[PDB]
Amino acid sequence: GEIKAIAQEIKAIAKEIKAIAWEIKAIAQGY
Amino acid sequence: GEIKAIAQEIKAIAKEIKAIAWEIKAIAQGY
Amino acid sequence: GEIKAIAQEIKAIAKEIKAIAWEIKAIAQGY
Amino acid sequence: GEIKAIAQEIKAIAKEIKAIAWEIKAIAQGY
């Protein structure tokens, strides 16, 4: 139900945040 | 309903973190 | 029980991530 | 069930994002 829907949405946002964090790490280390 | 409320809190803080990550990704390319 | 605890644990880690993201943002801004 | 499994997935991605955020702060601080 609703709690499963909300948990799938949080997992999608968490995977988006992790992809942006790896992009930021690339810029911080310059490669 | 108590677990759904904590999941909605988590989704809000995840959207806040994604917003800040986008602000960093912009700034860190000189945008 | 356990599902409420896992949700509380996620919320605490998300708050920690948000605090680190603000610190990273300040450096990215030049401060 | 599925809610517990997605919650444990979220908590593992959150801990990966916290680790990358601390790696980015280390690199930006020259630690």
| Experimental method, per PDB record | X-ray
Please list every residue in chain C whose beta carbon sits closer than 8 Å to the beta carbon of residue B16.
18
Helical pair A2-29 and C2-28, crossing angle rounded to 10 deg: 30
Which among A17, A23, A27 has CB closest to B18?
A17
The alpha carbon torsion through A21, A23, A24, A29 (nearest 10 deg) reads 120
For CA atoms B20, C15, B6, A24, the dihedral sign is: positive
Give the whole-angstrom CA distance, residue A13 versus residue A18: 9
D22 token code pair:
């601390």
- C-alpha B28/C-alpha A10 separation (Å) is 26
Cβ neighbours around C12 below 10 Å, total: 10
**What are the Cα distances from residue B31, in Å, to A23, B11, B22, B24, D3?**
15, 27, 11, 9, 39
CB D16 within 8 A of CB A20: no
- The resolution in Å comes to 1.3
Distance from CA of B4 to the nearest CA of A (A): 6
